[PDB]
Each structure stands twice: as structure tokens, then as C-alpha cells.
Amino acid sequence: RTFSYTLEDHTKQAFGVMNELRLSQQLCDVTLQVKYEDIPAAQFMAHKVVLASSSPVFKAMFTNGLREQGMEVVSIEGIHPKVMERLIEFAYTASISVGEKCVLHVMNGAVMYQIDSVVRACADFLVQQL
Amino acid sequence: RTFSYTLEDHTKQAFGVMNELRLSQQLCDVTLQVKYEDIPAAQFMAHKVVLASSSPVFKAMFTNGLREQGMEVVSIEGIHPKVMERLIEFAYTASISVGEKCVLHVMNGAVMYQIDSVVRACADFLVQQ
Ligand SMILES: *C1=C(C#N)C(=O)C(C)(C)[C@@H]2CC[C@]3(C)C(=CC(=O)[C@@H]4[C@@H]5CC(C)(C)CC[C@]5(C(=O)OC)CC[C@]43C)[C@@]12C
Ligand SMILES: *C1=C(C#N)C(=O)C(C)(C)[C@@H]2CC[C@]3(C)C(=CC(=O)[C@@H]4[C@@H]5CC(C)(C)CC[C@]5(C(=O)OC)CC[C@]43C)[C@@]12C
């Protein structure tokens, strides 16, 4: 007959493997230069595919049909490198933690990239504190 | 304290987006010229990263200091173009289905690529029947 297999935790474990690959600075086809006022530039390396899977705004960045000898390194202004880190991390972990006092800056970054899943999480939280 | 948030769906959802991006030849960074028997070259276009996430053998191919960030071509012997396809599917869908005619032949590709998950599930069904 016809045989079918589905491995349920496959999307989980392949991500942490992909996330390893990031931490390993391996297979990374983009490097993010996150400039925030006087804070010294922080370099975040990643794979475009994973960013583009987790951000609409990033998908449009790489699949803009406009790239050649360039755009390997992208300039991020107006995010604090530690906010951006937890965003980028959320893309690879599916989870985010943040000391509750910067929820609105993590919300503000997440909007910049349309991480609508945490933009809700963070706004709900903000509202409960009131 | 710390505010924490997880979105279990994200791993299912993101991979669908990459399978989309795969199916559109959007951010595909590698092309697998699968050359089996006298069947001519069959192109499979994919992203090294997703391939590397599913197959220990594939990660090994790419992190083998290829040093080649451009589009790579990769000639593939020993796997039928249609067995290769069934795995590339597992890579992005997390699932795979074939008739019993090829359950063993697809098992060989999964063995060739250390997809120990379908290797097992291939074997089990073979044993059941
Ligand atoms: C706040 C946290 C908490 N609790 C965190 O968990 C973070 C994610 C580590 C976060 C990183 C971003 C900054 C450094 C931050 C708190 C701040 O006060 C920072 C300020 C906010 C503001 C409004 C005072 C001016 C910008 C600034 C900054 O430039 O100072 C470094 C941005 C970064 C941040 C929001 C924590 C530590
Ligand atoms: C059998 C399927 C089934 N059911 C499939 O769904 C596959 C995975 C698409 C599979 C692709 C590979 C071949 C073409 C195949 C049927 C076969 O029997 C083919 C034979 C197997 C064998 C041992 C009889 C001799 C080699 C050969 C072949 O005929 O070369 C083209 C290899 C390919 C395949 C296993 C299906 C369609």
C-alpha cells in the first residue's frame, strides 16, 4: 500500500539546529550592523531564509529582486542591539524573554519587523500592568 | 521579574514559509544536480540551511569549508531524482508518503542522508508487512 510518515517534532529540532548554525556563524548569508546612537556597532549574523520565515519585513528585504555584489551586510538604525538580539533570537527559538521594563522597546522593534506574534504578546502585557 | 513569551506554532509556521520560499526559487542558495542512471540531470533548488537542518549528511556537505557563498551546484549520484524529491519534502514539510513499491528505495536515500527518522519509520512499516 501507500505509506505515510510525519515526524511531529521535526520543525522544532531543525530550528535549534539552524539556530546552532547561526551561533556557529555558519551558513550565514547576511550580517546585520545594528547602529544605535553611540553604542558600538553589534554584528548579528543570520540566514536570510529564517529571518524571512519569521519577519514579513525581512522577507521583502531579501526577496526584493534587487541584490547583486551587495546587501550581504544590512544597516539597522534605531534598535538597541540587545533588543534586536532578542528579536533575532525569537526568529530562531520561537520564544523571547525580556525584563519587563523594556517591553515597549521590544514591542517597538517587533513592529519594525512585523513580528506580529510578539507585538501582540507585548502589547497585551503592557495593558495588563495598567 | 521577566516577561516571557513562546509561540509553539512558530516552528510549523516558519517552515511552511520556507517551503513556500523554496517552491518559488526565492532564497534558494544551492542546486542539487541529481544524476542517477541514464536519467539526465534533474535540478533541485533549495536552501543549504534547511537542508542542513534536516540531514546530518547535508550540513556536512555545506559546512565542509565550501567557502562558496554564491549559488552552488552539487552533483548527486546514487539517488533517483524522485527519491531525492521525497526527502527534500520531508525537509520542509516534516512528512513524506510513498507507495510500498519504493518504501525500501526511499529508505535507502534516508539512510544515505542520515534521516534516521524515516529510516526507522520506513523500516517499521516494512516489518509490519
Ligand atoms: C531593558 C531590559 C530590561 N529589563 C532588557 O531586558 C534589555 C532587553 C536587555 C534592554 C536592552 C535595551 C535597553 C538597554 C534596556 C533598557 C534601557 O533603559 C535602554 C534605553 C531606553 C531609554 C529610553 C532610556 C533610551 C534608549 C536606551 C539606551 O540607549 O540605553 C542603553 C535603549 C536601550 C534600552 C532599551 C534593557 C536593559
Ligand atoms: C515509486 C514510488 C512509489 N510508490 C514513488 O512514490 C517514488 C518515490 C516517486 C519512486 C521514485 C523512484 C522510482 C522511479 C519509483 C518506482 C520504481 O520502482 C523505480 C525503480 C526501482 C527498481 C528497484 C525497480 C529499479 C530502479 C528504479 C527505476 O526504475 O529507475 C528509474 C529506481 C527508481 C524507482 C524507485 C517510484 C515512482
UniProtKB/Swiss-Prot annotation, chain A:
Residues bearing the modification S-(2-succinyl)cysteine: C102
Knockout-associated phenotype: Early postnatal lethality caused by abnormal cornification. Mice survive until weaning and probably die from malnutrition resulting from hyperkeratosis in the esophagus and forestomach that cause gastric obstruction. Defects are caused by constitutive activation Nfe2l2/Nrf2, leading to constitutive expression of phase 2 detoxifying enzymes. Mice lacking both Nfe2l2/Nrf2 and Keap1 reverse the hyperkeratosis phenotype and are healthy and viable in normal conditions.
Cross-link position per record: N5-[4-(S-L-cysteinyl)-5-methyl-1H-imidazol-2-yl]-L-ornithine (Cys-Arg) (interchain with R-135 in KEAP1): C102
Modified residues (S-(2,3-dicarboxypropyl)cysteine): C102
Cross-link annotation N5-[4-(S-L-cysteinyl)-5-methyl-1H-imidazol-2-yl]-L-ornithine (Arg-Cys) (interchain with C-151 in KEAP1), location: R86
Residues with the S-nitrosocysteine modification: C102
Annotated effect of mutating R22G: Abolished ability to ubiquitinate NFE2L2/NRF2 without affecting homodimerization
Subcellular location: Cytoplasm; Nucleus
Site feature location: Sensor for electrophilic agents: C102
Source superkingdom: Eukaryota
Annotated domain remarks: The Kelch repeats mediate interaction with NFE2L2/NRF2, BPTF and PGAM5.
Function: Substrate-specific adapter of a BCR (BTB-CUL3-RBX1) E3 ubiquitin ligase complex that regulates the response to oxidative stress by targeting NFE2L2/NRF2 for ubiquitination. KEAP1 acts as a key sensor of oxidative and electrophilic stress: in normal conditions, the BCR(KEAP1) complex mediates ubiquitination and degradation of NFE2L2/NRF2, a transcription factor regulating expression of many cytoprotective genes.
Oligomer status and interactors: Component of the BCR(KEAP1) E3 ubiquitin ligase complex, at least composed of 2 molecules of CUL3, 2 molecules of KEAP1, and RBX1. Interacts with NFE2L2/NRF2; the interaction is direct. Forms a ternary complex with NFE2L2/NRF2 and PGAM5. Interacts with (phosphorylated) SQSTM1/p62; the interaction is direct and inactivates the BCR(KEAP1) complex by sequestering it in inclusion bodies, promoting its degradation. Interacts with NFE2L1. Interacts with BPTF and PTMA. Interacts with MAP1LC3B. Interacts indirectly with ENC1. Interacts with SESN1 and SESN2. Interacts with HSP90AA1 and HSP90AB1.
Family to which the UniProt record says this protein belongs: Belongs to the KEAP1 family.
Protein name per Swiss-Prot or TrEMBL: Kelch-like ECH-associated protein 1
Species of the source: Mus musculus
UniProt lineage: Eukaryota, Metazoa, Chordata, Craniata, Vertebrata
